[PDB]
Every structure is written in C-alpha cells, then in structure tokens.
C-alpha cells in the first residue's frame, strides 16, 4: 500500500489520498485527516501491522517528502514514527518537479526516486517491479554500492 499525505506548516494532515487501491481500506480505518503527521503515520503503520502488510520479514517502510531547515523537522518526525514502531526506514527527499513526474506515472515519490536510481546504475528494474515489488525487495536491488551515500 502507498499513501500520500498533505500537511500544513504545523504538520497537521490536511489531505490524504490512496496512491493505489489497496491503500483505501487502510486510509478508511486510519482516518488521518486533520491529525498530527506523527499520529497519522503511527496509526497507518499500526493498521498495516494488523492487516499483515508489516511483519518481521518485511520490516522496512519507505517515506518520501517534498516541501512546497523545515524538512529536517519533517524528517525527524518520520524517523520517530518508524523507530517507535520498531520498523526500519528509508527516507528519500524529493522535489515538486519529481513529485509531478511521479504522479504522472502513478508512483509515489519514493518508488519513483528508487526506479530512476536503479536505471541510472544499470539495475534491471522494469516499471512493474518498481510499482509492485516490496519495499525490502526493491531496496536490496537498488542499494548495491554504485552511488553516493551520506548522512
């Protein structure tokens, strides 16, 4: 499941959309609208664990974010959400330019960034795999030491 949230400057969720059909039931039970970003994502992860999407094997969540040191506050919230839930995380900063390219092909900002990155490093990742492979699977395929890493 892929979910897109819109937040205001105080990190209140003002809009929420399922980026695929199997995100709809999780959004309905989570009801993230008007909630704090931390609360919204924490319940989304809680529901995901209940429904079976998050488990000991696939224990990685992929976040991506774009503005319009503010993003650092957002990034800290995303780290807290994952650590407090006991799941590993990858956070991929994005841009409005890339978000629109992702929307145009019905991909999340995170999967789009990862799909583009794999192509540039010569990894065999077709469009269907980029959209449907599990988070832990696509990260194992793309993160092979062929591009720069930093913290």
């Amino acid at each position: 499941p892929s979910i897109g949230l819109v937040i205001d400057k105080k990190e209140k969720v003002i809009d929420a959309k399922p980026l695929n059909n199997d995100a709809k039931p999780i959004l309905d039970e989570a009801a993230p609208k008007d909630m704090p970003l931390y609360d919204a994502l924490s319940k989304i992860l809680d529901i995901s664990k209940k429904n079976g999407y998050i488990n000991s094997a696939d224990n990685i969540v992929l976040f991506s974010a774009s503005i319009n040191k503010g993003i650092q506050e957002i990034i800290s919230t995303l780290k807290d959400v994952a650590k407090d839930a006991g799941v590993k995380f990858e956070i991929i900063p994005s841009t409005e330019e890339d978000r629109q390219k992702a929307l145009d092909q019905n991909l999340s900002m995170g999967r789009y960034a990862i799909y583009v990155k794999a192509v540039e490093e010569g990894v065999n990742l077709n469009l269907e795999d980029a959209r449907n492979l599990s988070v832990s699977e696509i990260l194992g395929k793309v993160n092979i030491g062929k591009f720069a890493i930093s913290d």
Binding site: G4, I7, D8, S48, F63, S108, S134, V135
Partner: peptide, 10 residues
C-alpha cells in the same frame, strides 16, 4: 500546502 509526504508499505 506546506509539504507532501508519501509512505510505501509492503
């Protein structure tokens, strides 16, 4: 408005 956040699970 201020920021967009996507989350991918499974």
């Amino acid at each position: 408005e201020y920021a967009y956040i996507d989350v991918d699970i499974n």
